[PDB]
Symmetry: C3
Subunit: 531 residues, 3 copies
C-alpha cells in the first residue's frame, strides 16, 4: 500500500519500488514542491515558501524541468540518464520540486545519511528527473534527493544591483536544502547529516554553497564532480549590466533603468523568454564575432546575499565553513560531450598550431586566455609533437585543464589549507552506456562517472562484471563519505586524504592512490595567468 | 426627511428613504455597500479581502453591478424571481462584492432589530442581490433585510483540487459578508446578536453549506434553506475536480502543464474572455447527444479543506457542527416548470413514455446523478403506475424534483434534528398570480413560487388578491418570528409543529395546516436505491 | 577620491565639482532613489520605501524625468535651466529620485541648513535635473536637494474615492521629505532645519504641504515662488469622477466602476498612458468647446489623506503648523512664458473689449471667472485706455493677478493672521538668460527669479556685474531665510516682515521695501467672485 508521509506543508503520497534482489522496498516520491511557483511577479525574486495543502498530495509524477532550450535539454538528459528508458519531460517556470528516494522503513524511525544531488547543464539546462536514485538508495542505504533550480534567464538574470541581484537559481538550491532540514526526518533521513553533490554546473553550485555563509548549517559533506567555483565560464566577474541590457534588448525591452528592464521582463511570457534564450545562442561557441563579447551562458554573480565577493577572495579568507570536501575530475573532461554540444570545428579530427591558436582565442569565453598568451599556452601543450591528431587531443587536454583540472586542484588546496578534510580523485573509465556517436578512444569523458555514482549498471542493460564492480565501489565510496566525511572502508582500496602530499585516488579499471594531481599544470597556468 | 447617513467601520454611507403604504416610518435603503475588496487581477481565485476604508460619504444609492454571468440567463431569472413591479436591468462586473440593506428602524434612535441575510439562488452560476427588494418584509415584519452578492461561476468556484486554487470563493464571499454584518449591522438598527441567513435553491444550498462549515460558526443564529440543501448533489462536486479544471483552462486557451500554471493563465484572462469561456462551456444546459456522465461537470461547491473538511454527508453524521434552529422546506412541484423551461428540457410534447423517460433520466445525469443501472427501478417506481403518457410525463417531473430537492431536504432535516437542534419543515403549495403566462395553469408550487410570499410581492406588484396578500402576510410573520425566536409560531398564526420524531411539518398554501412525515416513502425508496 | 556616503539603504558614490571662488569642492550625488519604483501594481498608490542595495551605488548619472510630454518637458527645462547647456533627459515611470548638492566637508560632522527644491511644470511636466544646485550650495553653504514626484496621470489620477484617491505626486514629495529626515545628516545636512521651496506648481505644492498634516514635522521654512494652494488651476474642487472617466475612456477602458477603471489603467503600458496624455491636450488653452469643460491639467484634489478639506477651509482654521513662510510673485507672471507655452491666441499682439471678453472666458479653467462676470473684469482692467496694444498688456496683468497676485496675497495674509512669520516679495527684473522669442519689454516674467535663486550667473555666460550682484543678494536672502526663518542679514537691504502694515520687498535693479502688494486688486476680485 502506497507510503504516505506528513511534511511541514501537508501529506505526500508516493509509491514503493523494488530493485531486483533487494527485499526492502524503496519509497519513491516524485514532484514534491519546496517553494512557491516563481510565476509572474515572483520571477527574478528569492524563492518563497510553498503554500500548505489540505489533504493528501499525490507525488507520483515527474515534475516539469525548468524552462530551457527543449532540444539541448532533452539531449543532455538522454546522455546523462542512468535509468533504462529516458523520460520525456515537460517545460515550465513552475519547476521548484525535488524527488526523494528512501530505503528507510517509514513505519519506523530512521536517520539514514542524506545525499542531495544537484544536476549540471551549464546553469542553462538540466533537470532532477534525469537522475533515478533507486540504485544508490538501495545499494548504500541512504536517502537520495534530486533537486531542481531555475535556469538561464529565469535563474540568473542580474542587473548587477538591488532591482535584480541575481543568483536566483542558487537561492533555489538553498531553499531545497532548507526544505530537507525541516522535512527529511519524515522520510527516514537524518537532517543532521546531509551531503551535497553535483556535477559540472552542479559541482560548481556545490562549490559556491561551500563558500556561501547562507548555506552554513545546511550541509555536512560536499562533493564537486568536474566543476568548482573557479570554473571561469560559470562565474561572471565584473560589470554584468551589459549582458543584462543585451538580454533586455533581445526580449524587446527598454534599458532606461534597471527597474524598467526587470519590470519589462516580468511582463514577458515564459515562451517569449524562451525565444529570447534561443536568440542569445547560449551553450554554443561563436566562430564569427569578437570572442571577448560572446556570452556562452548566464551564471553566478557576486550578488551580496549569497556571495559577498569573488570565490577567490573567499578562499584565502579561510572564512567559509569547513566540511569534508571531495573534489574530482575526469581524465578527458573536454574529450567529447562538451565540444560536441557546443559544435566545436573539429570535423577533421586534426589540428595544427595556427588553427589551435585561433580556436583557443575563439573559445575565450571558456578559458579567458589573453590573446597575447595564446602562443605560450598552445606551444606548451601542442609544441612537443608534430602529430596533428595528437595536437588536437592535447588541445582538448589544454581546455580541460584550464576549465576543470587546475581550478579543482586549486580549490582542493585552499579547502585543505583551511584545515578541513579534503579528498580528490580522477575518474578514468569509459562507460558502456556512452553515446554511439562518441569516439571509442575517449576515456573518462565529462559525465562518465555519473553512471557509476548512480548505479547505471543496475538499472540499464549490458554492464560487464568490471563495470558493475566499478559502480559498487564508487557508490560505497560516495556513501561512506556521506556518513563519515571519509570514503574509506573495508573491502575498498585505500583513498589517501588530500593533504600536503596531495595524494588522490585514480578511479577506473584499476583503482589506486597516486599523488600530486595536475601539479605541473597548476604551476604553469597560475604563472601564465599572472602575466 | 433628509437622506439617512450611517457611519460604518470603513466609512460613512448615504442611503435614501422609501415609504410603503401602511407604514409611517420611512424605510432606509442603502444600495451597493462594499463588504470586501474588489476581487480583480491577482485577487481573482483568492479568498475575499477586507474592503479599503473611504474618506467621506460614500453614496450607496445605485444598484451595484452583478457578478459576471450569462447576461441573458441572469436577466431572465431576475425577471422571474423579482418581487418588484418592474425588473431592474443590471450591469456585469467582477467588482460585484456588495450588499443591499433595507432597515425600517428610525436611524435617529437606538434600534436592535433581528437581521435577515438573503442569499440568492441561480445554480451558483447566475443571480443578483438587486433582484430582491426587501422593502416589504422589512417594514411589515420590522426586521433589517440584507441581500448579498458573491462570485459566481468560474470566478467564484474555479477549482484545481489543490492549494493553487482550492475553490468555493463564492462561499468565502458569503462568510465575508456575514462577518461584515456582525461588525456594521448595528449602525443600521440591526441586532448583530440575531442574524438569520436564508436563501433558496443555490442560496439554500449555500445556507445549508454555511450551517456545516466551521468558518461560519458564530456569524448567524438561525438558518433557512428554501428548496435546496447540501445534499442537492448537482451543486456539490465529490471526487477529482482536476479534469473539469483542465477542460476550463483549455476552453479559455491556457496550458495545463500544472495547476499553478493553469491558475496563473486564467488570472491573466480578461472578464470578457472568461465570459466567452463560460458561454462555450454551455452550463445550465442539458446535453442530449454526448455521454451523460461527462455531460458537463457543473461548476459548484467542493471539499476544499477550508470551508468544508469533508463531504456534507460525513459532516451531518458528525453532530459536530454548531447547532442553530434550522428551517428546511420545499415547494410542491420543484421541477414543475421553471427549471425544465430554463434548461430547455426535451418535454415539448407534454407526453412521455417509459422508454423515453429512461433516456431523459439518463441524459439528465448531472441533475439527479442516477446510475444508468438504476434508471429502470426508479422509472418504474414513478411511471409504471399509469398508462396515460401525459400522467407519466408529470410523474417524471415529480421524480426529478424528489431526487434533487424533496428527499435531500428531509434527510438534512432529520440529521439536523437528530443532532439535537430545533428543526422545522414546510411544503409550500400555491400558484402566485405573478407567475409568467407561459406557465401551465396546472402547476402549483413551482420552483421559486414561495419567493413572492416571503418577499411580499403582493405589496409591490399589482393585482394581488386578498387570499394572496393574506398568504404573504402569514409567511413573513412566520419567517420573522423564526428570525427573532428560532421558532416560527406566534399569535394569529396556525400551529407549526416542530420537526421532531413525529416529523410534523407545515403545509403552506390557501389552506395552511400541519401534517406529518413529508416524503417519508420517497426517502426510504431512494435511500434504498442509491444504496445499490 | 570620489565621496562615498552611508545612507539607511546603502552606500552612494558621488563626485566632486569645484566652483571658481571656493576651495572646498561640492559633493554632488545624482539619482538617489527615495522610494520603490512605482511600476505595475504600485501605480496609483502611495510611494513605498526603496529596497536596500548591497554594495556601492553610483549616484553619478542624471535620473529620468517622470513620464510626460517629452517636447513640452524639454522646452520648459531649456527655458528654466540655470546651467550653461541644458541636459537631455530620458522619460520613465521609474522617476522617484532626488539630487543632492552638499558643500560640507564630509570628513567631519556638519549640520548645514537643508533646502529642498520642488520644480514646477503644472504637475504635468518638469524634472529635478533641470536645476543645478552647485552655485547656491557653495555660495551660501547649504545642502541643496532637488526632488522629483510623479506627474500627470501617474501622479494625479483620482477617481474621487478609496480606489484611487489621487495626490500621488504630493505623497511622493512627502516621501522625499521623510527620506531627508532620515538620511540628510550623512550628507552634512541638518534634518532639524529643512526649507522647502518651489515655483509655480512647485510653489503650489509647497503651499499644499504647509496645509497638510502628512508633512507636519518634515520641514521648518517654506517658500512659494509664483504659486500657492489658492492658484485655482492646480486644485480640483467638486466631482472629479468626470475627468477620471474621460481619461479612462481615452485610454480605452470601461467605466463600469472606479475599481475597474483603476485596474484597467494599472495595466496600460507607459507608452499607452503617454499617448492618452498627449491626446488629452493638457497645458493647452482649448479654443473650440465649452470653457467650463476643458481640462488644462490634472492636479491636487481633496483626497482625505493629504488634504482633509479645501485650502480655503484649511487657512481659516489656524490649525496647520505655523512655519516661517515666504510667498512671492513676479511683476509679469503672464508676460510671455505661460501664454507662449499654452499657445495663447495673442498672435495679433493687440486686443479689444470684444476679443478680451471671449478670451477671458475660453481661459475659464485658469481664472475661473464666470461668464456673467467677464464684463466687470474686462472693464476694470481694459476700460482705462483705448490703446488696443495697452489692452492686451493689461489683459496679461489681469490673468496674472487672478492666477498669482491675488491668491498669493490672500495666502500670505492668512498665514500672518494665523500668527506665523510671513514674508513677501515682488520680483521685477529681466534676466539676460531670457529667450530671443521673448519681447524685451517683458520684465519679471514667470520664473524669472529662478536665475537669481539658483545662481545662473555663476554657471551660464554673459552675466553683467549687476545681474551677478542681484543673484548673490537673492541667494543670501533665501539662504538666510533657511537658517533663521528671517531673510535679513548684515549688508542686505532691509526686508520688512509681512504683518498688518503688509510690508514686502521689491527685488530688482533697485531692491527696496514697499507696502500693501496687490492690496487693491485683492479687494476688487474678492468682491467680484463673491457673486
Ligand atoms: O563530430 C564529428 C566527427 O568529428 C570527429 C573527427 O572526424 O571527432 C572530432 O569532433 C568531436 C566532437 O564531436 C571531438 O570530441 C573529437 O575529439 C574530434 O576529433 C569524429 O570522431 C566525429 O564523429
Ligand atoms: O405553455 C408552455 C408550453 O410548454 C410546454 C412544451 O414546451 O410544456 C412542457 O415543458 C414545460 C417546461 O418547459 C413543463 O413544465 C410542462 O409540463 C411540459 O408539458 C407545453 O406543454 C406548455 O403548454
Ligand atoms: O506668436 C504670438 C506673437 O504675439 C506677439 C505679438 O506679436 O506677442 C504676444 O503673444 C505671445 C505669445 O507667445 C506673448 O508671450 C506675448 O506676451 C504677447 O504680447 C509676439 O511677440 C509673438 O511672437
Ligand atoms: C496530475 C498531475 O500531473 N499533477 C500531479 C501533481 C504534480 O504534477 C506532481 O506530482 C508534483 O506535485 O502533483 C499532485 O499530487 C499535486 O500537486 O497535488 C497532483 C497530481 O498528482
Ligand atoms: C456602477 C456602480 O454600481 N458603481 C457606482 C458606485 C458603487 O457601485 C456604489 O457604492 C454602489 O452602487 O458608487 C457610485 O454610484 C457613487 O457613489 O456615485 C458611482 C458608481 O456608479
Ligand atoms: C541604470 C544606469 O545605467 N544608470 C545608473 C543608475 C542610477 O542610479 C540611475 O540611473 C539614476 O540616475 O544606477 C547606478 O547609479 C548604480 O546603481 O550603480 C549607476 C548607473 O550608471
Ligand atoms: C493519485 O493522484 C490522483 C490525482 O492526480 C488521484 O486521483 C489518485 O487517487 C491518486 N492515487 C492514489 C493516492 O492511489
Ligand atoms: C450620489 O453621490 C453624489 C456625490 O457622492 C451626491 O451628490 C448624491 O447626493 C448621491 N446620491 C444622491 C443622488 O442623492
Ligand atoms: C561606480 O563607480 C566606479 C568608479 O568609482 C565605476 O568604476 C563603476 O563603473 C560605477 N558603477 C557602475 C555604474 O558600473
Ligand atoms: P556542465 O554543467 O557545463 C559546465 C560548463 N554540462 C556539460 C553538464
Ligand atoms: P437554483 O439555484 O438551482 C439549484 C440547482 N435556480 C433554479 C434558481
Ligand atoms: P507653472 O507650474 O504653472 C502654474 C499654474 N508652469 C508655467 C511652469
Amino acid at each position: 500500500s502506497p507510503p504516505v508521509v506528513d511534511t511541514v506543508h501537508g501529506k505526500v503520497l508516493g509509491k514503493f519500488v523494488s530493485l531486483e534482489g533487494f527485499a526492502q522496498p524503496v519509497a519513491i516520491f516524485l514532484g514534491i514542491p519546496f517553494a512557491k511557483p516563481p510565476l509572474g511577479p515572483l520571477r527574478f525574486t528569492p524563492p518563497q515558501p510553498a503554500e500548505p495543502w489540505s489533504f493528501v498530495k499525490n507525488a507520483t509524477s515527474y515534475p516539469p524541468m525548468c524552462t530551457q532550450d527543449p532540444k539541448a535539454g532533452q539531449l543532455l538528459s538522454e546522455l546523462f540518464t542512468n535509468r533504462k528508458e529516458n523520460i520525456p519531460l515537460k517545460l515550465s517556470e513552475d519547476c521548484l520540486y525535488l524527488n526523494i528516494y528512501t530505503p528507510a522503513d517509514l513505519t519506523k524511525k530512521n536517520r539514514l545519511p542524506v545525499m542531495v544531488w544537484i544536476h549540471g547543464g551549464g546553469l542553462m539546462v538540466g533537470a532532477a528527473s534525469t537522475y533515478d536514485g533507486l540504485a544508490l538508495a538501495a545499494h548504500e542505504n541512504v536517502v537520495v534527493v534530486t533537486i531542481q533550480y531555475r535556469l538561464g534567464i529565469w535563474g540568473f538574470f542580474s542587473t548587477g544591483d538591488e532591482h535584480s541581484r541575481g543568483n536566483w537559481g542558487h537561492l533555489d538550491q538553498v531553499a531545497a536544502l532548507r526544505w530537507v532540514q525541516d522535512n527529511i526526518a519524515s522520510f527516514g533521513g537524518n537532517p543532521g547529516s546531509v551531503t551535497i553533490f553535483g556535477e559540472s554546473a552542479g559541482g560548481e553550485s556545490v562549490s559556491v554553497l561551500v563558500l556561501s555563509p547562507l548555506a552554513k548549517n545546511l550541509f555536512h559533506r560536499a562533493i564537486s564532480e568536474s566543476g568548482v567555483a573557479l570554473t571561469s565560464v560559470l562565474v561572471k566577474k565584473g560589470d554584468v549590466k551589459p549582458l543584462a541590457e543585451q538580454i533586455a534588448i533581445t526580449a524587446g525591452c527598454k534599458t532606461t533603468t534597471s527597474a524598467v528592464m526587470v519590470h519589462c521582463l516580468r511582463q514577458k511570457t515564459e515562451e517569449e523568454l524562451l525565444e529570447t534564450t534561443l536568440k542569445m545562442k547560449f551553450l554554443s561557441l561563436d566562430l564569427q564575432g569578437d570572442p571577448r563579447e560572446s556570452q556562452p551562458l548566464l551564471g553566478t554573480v557576486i550578488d551580496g546575499m549569497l556571495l559577498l565577493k569573488t570565490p577567490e577572495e573567499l578562499q584565502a579568507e579561510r572564512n567559509f565553513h569547513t566540511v569534508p570536501y571531495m573534489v574530482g575530475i575526469n581524465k578527458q573532461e573536454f574529450g567529447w560531450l562538451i565540444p560536441m554540444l557546443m559544435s566545436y570545428p573539429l570535423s577533421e579530427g586534426q589540428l595544427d598550431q595556427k588553427t589551435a591558436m585561433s580556436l583557443l582565442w575563439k573559445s575565450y569565453p571558456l578559458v579567458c586566455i589573453a590573446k597575447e598568451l595564446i602562443p605560450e599556452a598552445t606551444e606548451k601543450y601542442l609544441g612537443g609533437t608534430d602529430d596533428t591528431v595528437k595536437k588536437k587531443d592535447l588541445f582538448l587536454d589544454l581546455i580541460a585543464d584550464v576549465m576543470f583540472g587546475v581550478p579543482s586542484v586549486i580549490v582542493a588546496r585552499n579547502h585543505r589549507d583551511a584545515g578541513a578534510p579534503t579528498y580528490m580523485y580522477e575518474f578514468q573509465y569509459r562507460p558502456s552506456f556512452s553515446s554511439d556517436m562518441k569516439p571509442k578512444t575517449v576515456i573518462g569523458d565529462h559525465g562518465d562517472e555519473l553512471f557509476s555514482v548512480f548505479g547505471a549498471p543496475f538499472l540499464k542493460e549490458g554492464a560487464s562484471e568490471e563495470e558493475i564492480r566499478l559502480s559498487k565501489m564508487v557508490m560505497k565510496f560516495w556513501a561512506n563519505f556521506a556518513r563519515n566525511g571519509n570514503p574509506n572502508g573495508e573491502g575498498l582500496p585505500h583513498w589517501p586524504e588530500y593533504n600536503q602530499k596531495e595524494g588522490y585516488l585514480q578511479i577506473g579499471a584499476n583503482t589506486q592512490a597516486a599523488q600530486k594531481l595536475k601539479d605541473k599544470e597548476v604551476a604553469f597556468w597560475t604563472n601564465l595567468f599572472a602575466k
